[PDB]
Amino acid sequence: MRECISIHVGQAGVQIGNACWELYCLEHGIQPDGQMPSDKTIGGGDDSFNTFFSETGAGKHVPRAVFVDLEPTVIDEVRTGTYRQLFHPEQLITGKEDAANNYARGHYTIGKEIIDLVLDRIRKLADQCTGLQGFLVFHSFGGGTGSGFTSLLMERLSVDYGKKSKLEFSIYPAPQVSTAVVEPYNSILTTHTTLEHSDCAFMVDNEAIYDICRRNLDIERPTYTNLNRLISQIVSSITASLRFDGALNVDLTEFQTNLVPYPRIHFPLATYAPVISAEKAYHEQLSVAEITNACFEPANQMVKCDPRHGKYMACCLLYRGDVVPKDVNAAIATIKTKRSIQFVDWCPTGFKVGINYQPPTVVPGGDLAKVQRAVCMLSNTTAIAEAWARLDHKFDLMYAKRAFVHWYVGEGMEEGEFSEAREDMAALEKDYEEVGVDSV
Amino acid sequence: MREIVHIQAGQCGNQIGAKFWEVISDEHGIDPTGSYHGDSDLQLERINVYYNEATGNKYVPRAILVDLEPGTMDSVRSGPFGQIFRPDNFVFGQSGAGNNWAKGHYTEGAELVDSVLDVVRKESESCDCLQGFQLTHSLGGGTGSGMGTLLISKIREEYPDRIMNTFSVMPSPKVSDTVVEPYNATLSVHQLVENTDETYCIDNEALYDICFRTLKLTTPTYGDLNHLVSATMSGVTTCLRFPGQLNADLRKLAVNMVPFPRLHFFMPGFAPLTSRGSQQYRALTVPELTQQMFDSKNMMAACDPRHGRYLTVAAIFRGRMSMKEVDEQMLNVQNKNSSYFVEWIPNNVKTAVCDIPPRGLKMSATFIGNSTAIQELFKRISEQFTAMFRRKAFLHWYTGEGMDEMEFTEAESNMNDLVSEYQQYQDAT
Amino acid sequence: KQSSISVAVRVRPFTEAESNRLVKIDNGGLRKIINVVDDRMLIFDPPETNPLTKMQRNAFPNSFKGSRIREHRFVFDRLFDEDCTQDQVYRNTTQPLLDSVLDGYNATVFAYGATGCGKTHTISGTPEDPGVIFLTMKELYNRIEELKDTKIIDISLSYLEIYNETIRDLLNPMTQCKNLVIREDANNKISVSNLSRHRPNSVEEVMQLILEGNKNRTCSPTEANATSSRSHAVLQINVIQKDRTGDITEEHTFATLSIIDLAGSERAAATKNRGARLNEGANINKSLLALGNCINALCDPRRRNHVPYRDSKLTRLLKFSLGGNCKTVMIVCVSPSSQHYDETLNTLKYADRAKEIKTK
Ligand SMILES: CC(=O)O[C@H]1C(=O)[C@@]2(C)[C@H]([C@H](OC(=O)c3ccccc3)[C@]3(O)C[C@H](OC(=O)[C@H](O)[C@@H](NC(=O)c4ccccc4)c4ccccc4)C(C)=C1C3(C)C)[C@]1(OC(C)=O)CO[C@@H]1C[C@@H]2O
Ligand SMILES: Nc1nc2c(ncn2[C@@H]2O[C@H](COP(=O)(O)OP(=O)(O)OP(=O)(O)O)[C@@H](O)[C@H]2O)c(=O)[nH]1
Ligand SMILES: Nc1ncnc2c1ncn2[C@@H]1O[C@H](COP(=O)(O)OP(=O)(O)NP(=O)(O)O)[C@@H](O)[C@H]1O
Ligand SMILES: Nc1nc2c(ncn2[C@@H]2O[C@H](COP(=O)(O)OP(=O)(O)O)[C@@H](O)[C@H]2O)c(=O)[nH]1
Ligand SMILES: [Mg+2]
Ligand SMILES: [Mg+2]
């Protein structure tokens, strides 16, 4: 089987998980109460849902999820809302205050009070899995919980499992928009766990998705629900190969083999090209060539970075719906003809291609329209380093005067660590400057 | 689960607390008798934050009333909501402080502090998890200021790792109902700077100005000012009690607002404030709340933020709204008024959002600023304090209660050091 | 220019039980992360591994798996390498202070270091190899004896400790912490109140007093060591002096020598016990941060407008014992074993914050 375990840390991760599990339940026909009516209607036994659900004897489906937060508010919302009966009752809350936006409180003092329960539940979920593929971790760099508890949890997972894949779907701080003063400290202190433990980290900033919603979907007042729905579409496109048949299936291991050239260069950028409103679903052909070209536009990137200021080291395209390989070949040839999309000289091939026959499913009340075709592009490029550099500058502006440092050192953290993580980030940036240089 | 123990000290603190409990009972649907007659489940989801359950389906607020004279206790008991409080929590003496800090801190308050702390311990040990404490009082007075500082110090000794807010009513330069306001205010600021995490400075002059200008009230009374302070207090702790897109407790605000351990004097404000016959002439949207919040006239502390620089800001919104609008508005405020924000903090504005607006309003927001202009208040107190201390105008009333002039000198030096520290982050660099 | 605050860093020598246990790999393990190049220049975590080329080629743009660089260049006002003994350490570090204390100005010594660093050896030592304190006070009593004529000198010893931002008199226990309050006299003297001031007549009496004070220090078990200390111990020697046969009058001149043994920084180390341990560690870390900020502000000419003395009791107590008038020296003791690797780096970083000498 092809099981994948999803972990949702913090408010951002939990709400992204709400969107993700809404999309999965609608994709597989599972009702919010866990009962799939196709078994009573058709008979069942000819469906593929083990990647995200487990069957009981009664016919109920339990998702393979671990909702964890250090406060009860968001998990209580999940436990009271529509999907109260879907998830297993074991959704972990610390019966205390949350991390309050600092890495130290969520890593050293409060995070170590519920770590054992989380690891025990993950052990129980992994024991039920016969063919476990990897982990999908959702959190936010800027949050206290999403940084500290994520670091602790990934340390424990690397110690225990090690060989299993771990994918990071994180929310990175934006260049200008922010919702906390101490975002740079939390994001910089998360460099170690997202560099040394994670195998492939997907980063997204709200500013880019806000711009996409404003321009593509024609929504002038978007909220976090739309952002979570887009991220859910991305994760669904990533994991579609494990769930449905296709002309060219691409699982997680093949994806990592094709996209990650060196062990440290594992921070690709994600893109969903054919995001359009129902009104603009007409007046557009949305053939494979147009969508593939739309993937490469710097405006459609979900991180505020310009790929034109860097070299595409690798790319993986994952198509869904009515797509033929020859159309994808023509699109890739058209892309390779272009001069503004520059590739490193040591990757002549460049493109990994996967195709799936299951088109995306539209959530009722959502923003995205019903489309015959879709594609998700995941590109390892050197431009992402710029998105880090801005953040580093912010960190310096706060660390010269040691602002807010007393809060961190008062929760079991040494002052020197602040420098060490920064140095690590700097080292990572240097690597992204050294891979892109042309060979002698 | 994030229980707050509320303490009221003095006449001003008791009145503000009575209005605050009226407002919170209205918010959660609690009647004066104590029974719940609401219409939404969410109101009961986090009733435990402020209330304790009681056998006959009752909700007794977790309030502790303190005073050194019984008149205000009788007034609160006879009030519309007086029956909701626990009779055992009414702690009071018989001889007042005489509007003297020494009586309330050393002689008369030291006798009642033991009983108050016994009730405080009894309330605290009933909490599943205690977020912290929440004191309301006025520094310009007698029993309120002295008892508040003494209880702050002793509770900090007993509960060093718990949040300690304080809604202290500063003395105004113009409005002055007492002659010895500077001594009490100085001796209280000397204690608050050492033993608190957040101190929401409030001034009667600013509340009166808000009532006269913003609300266009003809004859404002202490009820209206207490109403404003109640709206502020309810807005601060809104994310503890209701769900939202971005939650923010008291500790999160303490972490974000405070750059250095001594700069924890905040300037509060409430966003939607308009006359009775002028709501129909304005659309209630996020830009309107944003531009009213950062407006100088809306501050409740009698300071001009344009005379200093915002070290940090917090905006706690309530209502259904788009996060893009809030983020864009905060970013626009930061960029347009970049002179009034310190350069060595890339983002001075924290944002939190709640999904449940206050009854009646479609939207609302609460502003908690932290800016250098607050130092002006302390300077004004010094401008009076020295003027009364070189000649020792009313000193014998204080030294007759066991106090020494060394305490006055230490308090003055500490406040001057605080003013200098706030001034250090005003010059561009 | 001069920059009265000075940093001297001492490298501990390997113990016999260390070398044989660790040096096997060279012929845990003996990497010897610390390497002294010059009296103001050292290397932390150098590329001294002989079989390094085979992967140093990969460190270049060939294979990005070990491109991280931990080689740290550190510059300090004074250094003491493995073969340094105690006598010249005393000469270089605390001997000049004895002039200033007798000149009229105060003097201050800090002693910082992590666990297993040799701080106790440096400040106290052994009966056969006396530490810096014994040598300093013996020389002070000697210089009193030479200057006995034409000038009368009195010595007052006090010894307190700071713990959870509360003061405790080590030489007079069962005293409420609320009684020990820090003040500020009009003549720029701190003089914390209700301290049992002793008038020892010899260095042996001073050492006896130090021993009884250390007997009352606050320690706790269940850590990396079962006696690692949880508080900042401050020993103050007030040297009062006046002219014997000259201008015989009530006026006199007095100075203070402060010696501060600092508790090392804390990382909790997953102390499941936690409890007070967390509060103790948080207070220690906050006090260390406040002291570092004060020292950095003093060394920085731009931020001299305001120094955050009020942030902690330790900083407040030494308000007039760190500035330009007072001479400050800081003994940072570090161990060369990799077993304490990260800890040593943290200690070295705390030594670097005093003066950021980027121009090596
Ligand atoms: C017809 C209509 O729109 O009625 C409004 C109203 O006219 C206005 C002017 C209200 C009104 O407020 C005042 O006139 C006022 C007077 C003195 C001091 C402070 C306010 C109102 O009284 C206030 C009252 O507010 C509430 O109900 C909130 O829930 C408030 N609670 C209370 O005022 C309260 C009521 C009963 C018992 C205890 C408290 C609240 C605010 C923040 C946090 C929690 C609760 C409302 C809807 C109105 C009236 C009734 C006229 C305003 O109220 C607030 C505090 O937001 C003042 O400007 C706003 C905007 C409103 O438009
Ligand atoms: N895209 C997206 N981002 C979110 C969402 N919710 C919160 N965030 C981001 O999360 C950041 C704040 O950190 P949080 O993750 O909410 O903090 P936390 O994980 O709850 O941990 P605590 O600070 O202890 O509460 C903000 O900058 C938001 O941009 C969401 O629903 N969608
Ligand atoms: N300069 C030195 N010459 C010889 N031996 C030394 C020297 N410095 C330290 N040692 C020895 O190294 C060991 C560790 O030093 P020591 O002074 O005991 O640290 P410690 O105080 O026991 N650890 P801690 O209590 O956490 O500070 C002891 O056996 C010392 O005798
Ligand atoms: N907001 C408000 N302020 C008050 C009230 N009563 C007094 N004050 C202010 O508090 C000061 C007097 O303090 P007081 O309450 O008498 O102190 P106490 O006598 O020790 O309890 C005056 O300067 C007033 O400005 C009140 O009911 N509401
Ligand atoms: Mg949270
Ligand atoms: Mg020892």
Author numbering:
A (entry chain A): 1 to 440
B (entry chain B): 1 to 429
C (entry chain K): 22 to 48, 100 to 432
Give verbatim lines from the article.
The pathogenic yeast Candida albicans expresses a single kinesin-8 homolog, dubbed CaKip3, whose motor domain shares 60% sequence identity with that of S. cerevisiae Kip3. To understand the mechanistic basis for the dual-functionality of kinesin-8, we obtained seven cryo-EM structures of Candida albicans Kip3 bound to either the microtubule lattice or curved microtubule end mimics, and a microtubule-unbound CaKip3 X-ray structure.
This section interacts with helix-12 and a loop between helix-7 and the β7 strand of α-tubulin via residues Phe136, Ser139, Arg140, and one of the two visible conformations of the side chain of His144. For example, Arg140 is close enough to α-tubulin to hydrogen bond with Glu420 and Asp424 in helix-12. The fact that microtubule-bound CaKip3 showed more extensive loop-2-tubulin interactions in the open APO- and ANP-states compared to the closed AAF-state suggests that the interaction of loop-2 with the microtubule lattice restricts rotation of the minus subdomain of the motor domain.
